[PDB]
Write a protein that binds this ligand. Structure first.
Ligand SMILES: NS(=O)(=O)c1c(F)c(F)c(S(=O)(=O)CCO)c(NCc2ccccc2)c1F
Ligand SMILES: NS(=O)(=O)c1c(F)c(F)c(S(=O)(=O)CCO)c(NCc2ccccc2)c1F
Ligand SMILES: [Zn+2]
Length: 257
């Protein structure tokens, strides 16, 4: 099936998902000098006070924390968005080395990892239907650099040994995603896509300028995950990032400076 290897990785995805060569694919390189400051963009409103995390899962590509999104508990609005977007899950992409792992790049710089908080537009009723709409999803992207530890990440890191292989899940309640955010909500935004199959062109990307710092030990724990299922040949889950795709006819807007 699709993956990140030589034989099934990003360069092969277009054969099953022809939109891979589409006009609004993600991620992209954010050229900070070319991004246009838009004084009409609003501050992003991240309202995560009543978030209800449920479960953490290794899906063979990444790991994801899923949330109760059956009410307006953890929502994103404002910024470039019209309407209200409910948090459904977050996941990460990361490298085999600290100098790679992010999907977006900033002036061609790669970060060690990228956190994606995936939200869906409530006007479409459910995340599946939202993913079929051009304004269906909003993904808040946060870069991770290696330096000091991020305390709010540790609860995630410490459960990963229990979901080592594809298809493993664990209960993961009372996790507060506010502990994964940087101080500033200054961002770049552009219209794009899922960065994994099926690569739907349904995402308003909101990429925060300020990275979070995580420790080497934290990111080392991500790299102990396996792409393979229990009792198949071991392939460490590393380098689960799609490279930057052509910007084509898009402008990246900045909320700042
Ligand atoms: N992400 S979590 O459920 O594991 C957790 C922590 F473990 C944690 F240590 C923190 S902490 O680093 O801020 C210090 C003790 O509270 C937060 N923080 C959530 C938060 C962040 C900013 C403003 C309000 C809440 C936090 F959410
Ligand atoms: N990077 S990204 O945020 O575009 C991303 C993924 F990398 C990713 F793996 C996923 S997934 O694990 O759910 C695999 C499917 O692409 C989603 N999910 C987007 C989504 C969530 C709910 C309903 C429909 C799409 C997803 F949005
Ligand atoms: Zn992602």
């Amino acid at each position: 099936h699709w993956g990140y290897g030589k034989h099934n990785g990003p360069e092969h995805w277009h054969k099953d998902f022809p939109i891979a060569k589409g006009e609004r694919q993600s991620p992209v390189d954010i050229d900070t000098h070319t991004a246009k400051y838009d004084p009409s963009l609003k501050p992003l409103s991240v309202s995560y006070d009543q978030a209800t995390s449920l479960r953490i899962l290794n899906n063979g590509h990444s790991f994801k924390v899923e949330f109760d999104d059956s009410q307006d508990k953890a929502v994103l609005k404002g910024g470039p968005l019209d309407g209200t977007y409910r948090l459904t899950q977050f996941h990460f992409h990361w490298g085999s080395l600290d100098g790679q792992g992010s999907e977006h790049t900033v002036d061609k710089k790669k970060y060690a990892a990228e956190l994606h908080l995936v939200h869906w537009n409530t006007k479409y009723g459910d995340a599946g239907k939202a993913s079929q709409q051009p304004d269906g999803l909003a993904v808040l992207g946060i870069f991770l650099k290696v330096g000091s530890a991020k305390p709010g990440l540790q609860k995630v890191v410490d459960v990963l040994d229990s979901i080592k292989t594809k298809g493993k899940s664990a209960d993961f309640t009372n996790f507060d995603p506010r502990g994964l955010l940087p101080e500033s909500l200054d961002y770049w935004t552009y219209p794009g896509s899922l960065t994994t199959p099926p690569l739907n062109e349904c995402v308003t990307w909101i990429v925060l300028k300020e990275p979070i710092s995580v420790s080497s030990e934290q990111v080392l724990k991500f790299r102990k995950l396996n792409f393979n299922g229990e009792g198949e040949p071991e392939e460490l889950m590393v380098d689960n990032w799609r490279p930057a795709q052509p910007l084509k006819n898009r402008q990246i807007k900045a909320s700042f400076k």
